[PDB]
């Protein structure tokens, strides 16, 4: 019962306090901040005709895919800014998109509880639907490609399930969290997809083994987006209370909090850079923001979006960041 | 710039396809059914 869990709840807090007393994440205070990194313009990709919620890059940092309410999934390339696949979409109420690591498949999901899989490389000049994924009652909040065959996606039914595109079935079910699950972020090791659920608690999961090893709490309001640090030693979680945090893996606790007095909005998307020193943001004031994770200070502010951003992505080789604004504009800032 | 020119030509064609679908989507009215269930929603959708 809850009486037994009370002792366990207090026991883990004592261990967390011991780690919190060892360091303060500000012992150095001499990280030599770069300063003004104001990347301005030179990318004004257009083509959509409705609101945009997702924008995912490729492994080669060449192909960019975005999903909109118009029911048209479009694949873009930043270099030549010309549309390559203006493929149609069965569901108009979509909220996420995914791009295969091998550059062969894309995924879409929305309020219809369908995770459609499309094969880009087909010997017919037109993509087809690989199969229809069903089994969720909530909504495809965020979808990612675990590999070329196995994928992991979120749902609005507090259930994250691994999928098998070969035949179609939920190999594993992770229905062990109360709030709503909003987004997930994978790992280069292809083993961790820590959640960004609505109840302000990030729960870690293990691929092919249903279990939770650590839960990260300490956020107010809701959580809308989550990222993952490149080396796997930490990750950043974006809450809806205009606050950000950096949850370390070994420390398993919050060590930094990024929030200014004047700003009160929320985070809709967050993503690290290659080095991880500079962290981007998703503030809802019709503009994006960047925070320096080294000096714990704001590096700069960039704007130019008529509507507030909804998606954000950093290329795997850097030197390009895209913003999925609610307006039908995607800009790669450089 | 040979294949690039053809790629731009394909992009222009599918740009018109997205453009022409814009009026069709905008030519239809959108209504949202709201309220508690079993309150007469069946009689207004059948």
């Amino acid at each position, epitope marked *: 019962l809850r009486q037994e869990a009370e002792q366990l709840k207090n026991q883990i807090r004592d261990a967390r306090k011991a780690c919190a007393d060892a360091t303060l994440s500000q012992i150095t205070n001499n990280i030599d901040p770069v300063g003004r990194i104001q990347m301005r313009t030179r990318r004004t990709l257009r083509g959509h005709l409705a609101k945009i919620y997702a924008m995912h890059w490729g492994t080669d940092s*060449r*192909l960019l895919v975005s999903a909109s309410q118009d029911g048209k999934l479009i694949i873009w390339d930043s270099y*030549t800014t010309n549309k*390559v696949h203006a493929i149609p979409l069965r569901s108009s109420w979509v909220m996420t998109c995914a791009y295969a690591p091998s550059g062969n498949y894309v995924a879409c999901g929305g309020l219809d509880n369908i995770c459609s899989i499309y094969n880009l490389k087909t*010997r017919e000049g037109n993509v087809r639907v690989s199969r229809e994924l069903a089994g969720h009652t909530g909504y495809l909040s965020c979808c990612r490609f675990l590999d070329d065959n196995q994928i992991v996606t979120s749902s609005g039914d507090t259930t994250c399930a691994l999928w098998d595109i070969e035949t179609g079935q939920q190999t594993t079910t992770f229905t062990g969290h109360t709030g709503d699950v909003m987004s997930l972020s994978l790992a280069p090791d292809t083993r961790l997809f820590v959640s960004g659920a609505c109840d302000a608690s990030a729960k870690l999961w293990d691929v092919r083994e249903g279990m939770c090893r650590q839960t990260f709490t300490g956020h107010e309001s809701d959580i809308n987006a989550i990222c993952f640090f490149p080396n796997g030693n930490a990750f950043a979680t974006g809450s809806d209370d205009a606050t950000c945090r950096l949850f370390d893996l070994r420390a398993d606790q919050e060590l930094m909090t990024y929030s200014h007095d004047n700003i009160i909005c929320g985070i809709t998307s967050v993503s690290f850079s290659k080095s991880g020193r500079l962290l981007l943001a998703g503030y809802d004031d019709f503009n994006c923001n960047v925070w320096d994770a080294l000096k714990a200070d704001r590096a700069g502010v960039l704007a130019g979006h008529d509507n507030r951003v909804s998606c954000l992505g950093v290329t795997d080789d850097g030197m390009a960041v895209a913003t999925g604004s609610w307006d039908s504009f995607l800009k790669i800032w450089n | 710039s*040979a*294949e*690039d020119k053809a790629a731009v030509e394909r992009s222009k064609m599918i740009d018109r396809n997205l453009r022409e679908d814009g009026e069709k989507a905008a030519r239809e009215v959108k209504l949202l059914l709201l309220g508690a269930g079993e309150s007469g929603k069946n009689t207004i959708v059948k």
Partner: single-chain antibody
Amino acid sequence: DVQLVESGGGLVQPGGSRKLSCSASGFAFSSFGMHWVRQAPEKGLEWVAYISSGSGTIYYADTVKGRFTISRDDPKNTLFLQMTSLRSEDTAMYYCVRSIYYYGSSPFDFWGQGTTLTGSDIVMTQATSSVPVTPGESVSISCRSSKSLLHSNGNTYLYWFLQRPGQSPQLLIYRMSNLASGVPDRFSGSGSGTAFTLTISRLEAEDVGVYYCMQHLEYPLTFGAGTKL
């Protein structure tokens, strides 16, 4: 299944001419560019004409400029080609070619069965005409061009075909560094600027054929001399 069987050209006479009809099956014709290729009984392949997607762009060869007319029927999924005042040099067997143009695409990846009809351009020259080969050996085929094919975008325009005896050629390597779909990983190519080579290891009995190399920079589509293997 993809079928590109073409019906048309046969016995003709000087002055009189007649048209071609290439029928599509198993694929979307409207989203593909289409090409025609001549093969003389004693010579190699040759460009004829090209129709883009939606008939938005029209090209013709110098030898048939103002003489041949190209047209397509997207609803009927059939491709036509008008001919006027056929000459003796036009006596050759025709090819129907399927192609598409986008980033990462594989142009000239499928060819039709084929029917039998009875200066500024970049010069494609192959110094070798034939090579005796044995199973299990390694052979290198060198293809050279009069103009460098390396564009500022960082990609070159090289295509390779293998002439099976009695059927249509099949694409092997496109862009000199990408293998076509269905082609084993054994086939490979290398080059820089104008000295392009193709490397084959562990020769098999089926590997016998004639290799042709093309260029696509600008648009003087010409075929190579052809090396017999």
